[PDB]
Ligand binder design. Sequence first.
Ligand code: SFG
Ligand code: ZN
Ligand code: ZN
Ligand code: ZN
Length: 430
Amino acid sequence: AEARGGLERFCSAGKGRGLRALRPFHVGDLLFSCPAYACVLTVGERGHHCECCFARKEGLSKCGRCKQAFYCDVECQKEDWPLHKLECSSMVVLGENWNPSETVRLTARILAKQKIHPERTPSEKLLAVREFESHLDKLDNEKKDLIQSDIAALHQFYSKYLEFPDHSSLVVLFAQVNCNGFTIEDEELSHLGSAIFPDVALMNHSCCPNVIVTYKGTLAEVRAVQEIHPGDEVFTSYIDLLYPTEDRNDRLRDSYFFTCECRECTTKDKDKAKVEVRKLSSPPQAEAIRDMVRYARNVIEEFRRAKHYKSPSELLEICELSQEKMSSVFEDSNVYMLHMMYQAMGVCLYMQDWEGALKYGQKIIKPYSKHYPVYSLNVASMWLKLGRLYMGLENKAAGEKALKKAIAIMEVAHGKDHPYISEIKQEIES
Ligand SMILES: Nc1ncnc2c1ncn2[C@@H]1O[C@H](C[C@@H](N)CC[C@H](N)C(=O)O)[C@@H](O)[C@H]1O
Ligand SMILES: [Zn+2]
Ligand SMILES: [Zn+2]
Ligand SMILES: [Zn+2]
């Protein structure tokens, strides 16, 4: 018998172990699904999504003791209890002082799961957590310090409720989480939480992926976005494909310890349109473009840092400031301009500035459609957010057209029967 029908684990030369198709898969076909081995809901979503299954529901029943964990029903509460019990009492005693990072909370759950079920689970038919690559030999000083900081935080927040393996085993585990972890995003690409999907972790990376990972609660689903021929390796993208080749590879080396050699990374064809410059009298010299690229990659970091000391209103100004400055060199379609417009849209949405968010959305959509693949969750989510803004702003004609563009991509990536599709169709009707 086949562990996963039409697929097998194999040795991909220069890429360790990988996933291969045995039979053809065509666009929109489901290769496999994988329940979460461990998952944790992001703090920001407490009271809005079930802590166990991540369902977005009104009227979630809360935990009687800590009054902090929220659930669909007693069944979700019971499934989560082995994990929630590690935090419940600590959240009662320490208030806002109990703040382990999301990665630390996830790793605590993996430790709890490993102890109870040493044998392979249904989320490990092809690759087990114990087999995950860690790359300890490639970790630099800063990366080693970060893991050590995470281990101290784990002892700090869980020592009273969780027994630990030796320090070296914890180092290996946090390192495995870094190169095999997933984040779960909703239909608008909002961050819901972090998870471990061992069989999904088997797939190698390509900047030209042939599959897309989506979620049905905490169940990961893998669907083909191009034909996958018998014998082909199955590739997902580990990163945001919007960025130029150098940016993507700096991210792949930093988190996954490899340099990509895919067709897009070899030819760099998309880089010209991604770093688009404006047609002026001059025009911009290569040195001046390099300076704006460096300014752009720094403002990305400036914005992230500013979240700690600046108000949303101020963060919006950083985005406004940057766009104005970069526009002397950069076209609106330039990816660095889009990064700032996207961040500005999120701030607008947060400050209830529906109109400001809609104007940003209207500028992002066309360049997103060009830069991203045909089936991209980033493009689908942008059409959806645009559709929802128009619908909310009493423009049903433009709203319906945008929601329909989102559904058409989502039918491929999420499957025609996905609950997100039914939800959007119910928004078109009512
Ligand atoms: N395109 C690639 N080129 C080289 N190595 C890759 C590529 N994609 C993924 N990898 C490797 O696979 C790791 C991530 C794993 N989640 C993927 C399965 C991994 N190949 C394994 O044998 O466990 C990365 O940290 C790299 O070691
Ligand atoms: Zn639930
Ligand atoms: Zn509780
Ligand atoms: Zn690549």
